[PDB]
RNA sequence: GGGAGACUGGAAUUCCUGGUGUAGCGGUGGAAUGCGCAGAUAUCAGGAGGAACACCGGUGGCGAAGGCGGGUCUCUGGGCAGUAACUGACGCUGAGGAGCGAAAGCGUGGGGAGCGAACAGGAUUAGAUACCCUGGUAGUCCACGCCGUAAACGGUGGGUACUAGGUGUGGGUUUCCUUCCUUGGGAUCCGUGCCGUAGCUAACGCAUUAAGUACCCCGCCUGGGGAGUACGGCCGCAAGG
């Protein structure tokens, strides 16, 4: 179980009041995999430096997870598959 | 048509200069080239040819209702200096100067060196 | 050292390679 | 390489006493475990030649340690070989 | 054996020794062939000696590097370390020209008498002198003068400090006169004699 | 010379989220500033470059504005 | 930037589509082939695809060597420092042998934007099977395999001990100026440069990273051509080694 930091940018059209619950469900799998701990922070509706997928503004979410690499990869695959997620980026908050 | 405010695109290569006045939505309304003002061959790489082309384009934009323009220079320096000076000198007010040269992030292989 | 020796060696190797190119098919038919 | 717990368990099982870590038996056991892990890795990445060189170095070191053991005490060499499932 | 040829005004001569006429003639022919080869002077033989590239390699006839009057001091740590505010008492064109002349400065920023606006005079070259104002006005509103001058029809534009430096770099003028965006007043930037920019402010 | 503001006892950690700490390290054209003109140590220069590239990848800094 | 795998980001080139838009564009020392007038170049918007990763970026890091930098994740090798707990000479070298081994090249299957052997024209020339220009196939790319060569060079085999120093720079430990911010300075271990003693050399030069002083092991040389060629043999699909 290693710590990870996932930064996601979502399209601005969807309401912000649904970002926190919906993202919650996206973590449910990694919650039920191996007893993992999550910390979710949301600072969204910020204009991007460059246009991403015909969009200028985006919602930024930061998720601090402590989980197995396979679980994090599976979660990243699901997040990329979703059509309401413009981009994702996974970092390791360890020495790496 | 009447476009009071537009943009100026100057492409100064090593052997030619092309000046085009553009309705800011990106539509060329009047263009003059180095070879269009009576030059041909190496003669059209000179700064004087750039001066003549810039003045001709400035007039061909002025009678179309263009008053104030902003310049986007581009290309290795051959007659950019004289191009902007001539654009100003023909009664066309210059708003801003921007250097937008296509700069690759090390992409594509350049042609082999000459000798 | 001087490149004269290298010039002699490259000339010899080049001539041998040209000879091999000229007689490739004959060597194959006799080999 | 191996984690601390695997090293501790290998040393406890193969070490002569509860403290030694550089005894040839313990070194041979650790090298064999590392070799098997590296082999399992290389079965997937066939073109990882640098780790293959590292594996060669480990194999040579294990062979030298076994040579030293067989030169000092034959019975210990036989016991170690039979316990770790080695051939030569 | 001696041979002399007049190839289009160029004299090519050769001389050889030999044991008989045939050997001497053959050696003379070889020598003359070598001389004519070295004489060619046509483009194919004078193309490898012509200076090439822009900065790489140096030759006797290579184009000398164009050097500006100021010390280079590249954009890295260029800075603005000269800020004069000599005079903003109102003056006329002739008085401004005299204030120019003894200061030995090509351009000069003052405030005009009639307009009450900031203006910059400079040498207009063979045309005389040229006057640039923050807002262009005709000669009648301008205070009376006797020097032969002309007025620049364009107005001094509004732009920032970095934008002003960029415009000066991409426009190559000895100075730029403009209304500062933040300050809202006149400003004249010139490349100094040490490589920094000289910003003259009120 | 100049000081590696990170080797100090008050050196803030280098992250790709805090955009101002990276904007202070890139030129006005968006390019990464050299090490000599900055003065930071090699490890901190490399960390700064990595953070800048990551922030560019997550659309926090322009790609040469 | 040690290696392998997977996913993925942006600038730019090319092409396609749709607007604005005209008579040139392109190229050179100078031009002409060439492209365009059937709407080119230029400018904007959209789309497709391939390759390489500007800034960081250097005589700086890693690797036995070849060599290795867009980002993230997974797997994995090596090195250095300190403590010195542990084994107790287990070390060095290594004929043959095995493995890795730039680029080019070969085989099967893909991919093909740019560059580009061969090949066409244009130009220069007395002649141009070339240098320069316009096009351009293999190839460069990916997967699995072959070959086994390079100025594969530091033209300097591996290990060890000793022999004045001075100054850059990378990594790690610690004492004293002490603000303890500061390349403060000192000490020490491991790299990587420059200058210089003794010493060595035919000289140039090397000089604690020896080409100095010595010990252990291996490879190689015995005038230049003929020739790294012929014959024979081994390997290779072939080139060839």
**Residue F60 covered by a domain:** yes
- CATH code of the domain containing F32: 4.10.640.10
Sequence-distant (≥ 6) Cβ neighbours of residue F5 within 8 angstroms: F11, F12, F40
Looking at the structure of chain F, the number of domains it has is 1
Of B81, B84, B93, the CB nearest to E154: B93
Catalogue all structural domains in chain B, each as residue range(s) with its CATH number.
Answer: 2-115 (3.30.420.80)
- On whether the CB atoms of residues E128 and E152 are closer than 8 A, the answer is no
> Which letter does DSSP use for residue E64 in this model?
P
Strands E175-180 and E158-159: parallel
| Angle (nearest 5°) at CA A18 between A12 and A19 | 60
**Residue contact A87–F62, C-beta within 8 A:** no
Give all strands of the β-sheet with E158-159 in edge-to-edge order.
Answer: E158-159, E175-180, E186-191, E197-200
**Residue F4 covered by a domain:** no
Name the neighbours of D, counting chains with at least 3 Cβ pairs within 8 A: none
Closest Cα to residue B3, out of B98, B96, B92, B87?
B92
**Residue F47 covered by a domain:** yes
**Residue F5 covered by a domain:** no
Q: How many CB atoms lie within 10 A of CB A83?
A: 6
Q: Give the residue numbers spanning the domain of F44.
A: 11-65
CA–C1' nearest nucleotide, residue E52:
G29
Please report the resolution in angstroms: 3.5
CATH class of D1-88: mainly alpha
- Please report, rounded to whole angstroms, the spatial distance between the CA atom of protein residue F49 and the C1' atom of nucleotide G70: 12
Q: Using only C-alpha atoms, what is the Rg of chain E?
A: 32
Cα E26 to chain centroid distance, Å, stands at 59
Closest Cα to residue E65, out of E53, E74, E73, E54?
E54
**Experimental technique for the deposited model:** cryo-EM
**Residue F35 covered by a domain:** yes
Cα B23 to chain centroid distance, Å, stands at 14
**Residue contact F58–A7, C-beta within 8 A:** yes
* CB of D7 lies under 7 Å from some atom of strand G: no
Cα A60 to chain centroid distance, Å, stands at 8
Intra-chain end-to-end CA distance of chain F, in Å = 30
B near E: at least 3 beta-carbon pairs less than 8 Å apart = yes
**Residues 7-66, chain B, CB closer than 7 Å to nucleic strand G:** 9, 11, 13-16, 18, 20, 22-23, 25-29, 31, 33-36, 40-45
**Boundaries of every domain in chain D:** 1-88
Chosen from A49, A51, A52, A55 to mutate, greatest number of chain F CBs within 10 A = A49
Distance CA A8, CA A85 (A): 7
Closest approach of chain F CAs to the CA of A37, in angstroms?
A: 21
**Residue F2 covered by a domain:** no
Name residue E191's beta-bridge partners: E197
Sequence-distant (≥ 6) Cβ neighbours of residue E69 within 8 angstroms: E193
């Amino acid at each position: 179980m290693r710590p990870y930091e996932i930064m996601v940018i979502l399209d601005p059209t969807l309401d912000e009041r649904t970002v926190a619950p919906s993202l919650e469900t996206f973590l449910n799998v990694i919650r039920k995999d191996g007893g993992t701990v999550d910390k979710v922070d949301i600072w969204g509706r910020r204009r991007l430096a460059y246009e991403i997928a015909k969009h200028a503004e985006g919602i930024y979410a930061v998720i601090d997870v402590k989980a197995e690499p396979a679980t994090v990869s599976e979660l990243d695959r699901q997040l990329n598959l979703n059509e309401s997620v413009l981009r994702t980026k996974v970092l390791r908050t360890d020495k790496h | 048509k009447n476009v009071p405010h537009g943009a100026a695109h100057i492409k100064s290569t090593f052997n030619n200069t092309i000046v085009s006045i553009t309705d800011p939505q990106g539509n060329v309304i009047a263009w003059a080239s180095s070879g269009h003002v009576g030059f041909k061959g190496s003669r059209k790489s000179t700064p004087f040819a750039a001066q003549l082309a810039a003045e001709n384009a400035a007039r061909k934009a002025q009678e179309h209702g263009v008053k104030k323009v902003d310049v986007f220079v581009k290309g290795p320096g051959s007659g950019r200096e004289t191009a902007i000076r001539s654009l100003q000198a023909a009664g066309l007010e210059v708003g801003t100067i921007s250097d937008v040269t296509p700069q690759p992030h090390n992409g594509c292989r350049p042609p082999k060196r000459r000798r | 050292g001087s490149v004269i020796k290298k010039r002699r060696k490259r000339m010899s190797k080049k001539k041998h390679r040209k000879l091999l190119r000229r007689t490739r098919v004959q060597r194959r038919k006799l080999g | 390489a191996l984690t601390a717990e695997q090293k501790k368990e290998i040393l406890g099982q193969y070490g002569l006493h509860d403290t030694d870590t550089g005894s040839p038996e313990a070194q041979v056991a650790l090298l064999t475990k590392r070799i098997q892990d590296l082999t399992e890795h290389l079965k997937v990445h066939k073109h990882d030649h640098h780790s293959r060189r590292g594996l060669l170095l480990l194999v040579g070191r294990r062979r030298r340690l076994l040579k030293y053991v067989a030169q000092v005490d034959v019975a210990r060499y036989r016991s170690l070989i039979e316990r770790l499932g080695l051939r030569r | 054996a001696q041979a002399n040829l007049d190839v289009n005004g160029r004299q090519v001569r050769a001389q050889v020794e030999g044991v008989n006429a045939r050997e001497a003639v053959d050696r003379l022919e070889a020598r003359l062939r070598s001389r004519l080869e070295r004489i060619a002077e046509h483009w194919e033989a004078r193309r490898g000696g012509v200076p090439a590239e822009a900065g790489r390699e140096w030759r006797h006839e290579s184009e000398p590097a164009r050097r500006p009057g100021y010390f280079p001091r590249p954009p890295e740590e260029r800075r603005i370390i000269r800020r004069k505010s000599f005079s903003m008492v109102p003056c006329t064109v002739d008085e401004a020209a005299l204030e120019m002349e003894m200061l030995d400065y090509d351009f000069h920023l003052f405030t005009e008498k009639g307009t009450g606006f900031a203006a910059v005079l400079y040498k207009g070259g063979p045309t005389g002198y040229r006057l640039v104002l923050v807002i262009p006005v005709p000669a009648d509103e301008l205070s009376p003068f006797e020097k032969p001058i002309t007025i620049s029809t364009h107005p001094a534009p509004c732009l920032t400090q970095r934008d002003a430096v960029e415009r000066l770099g991409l426009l190559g003028l000895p100075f730029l006169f403009y209304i500062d965006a933040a300050e809202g007043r006149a400003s004249v930037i010139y490349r100094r004699y040490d490589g920094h920019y000289g910003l003259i402010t009120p | 010379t100049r000081k590696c503001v990170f080797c100090s006892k008050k050196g803030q950690t280098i992250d790709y989220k805090d955009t101002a700490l990276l904007r202070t390290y890139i030129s006005e054209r968006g390019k990464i500033r050299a090490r000599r003109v900055t003065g930071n140590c090699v490890q901190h220069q490399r960390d700064i470059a990595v953070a800048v590239k990551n922030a560019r990848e997550v659309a926090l800094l322009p790609f040469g504005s």
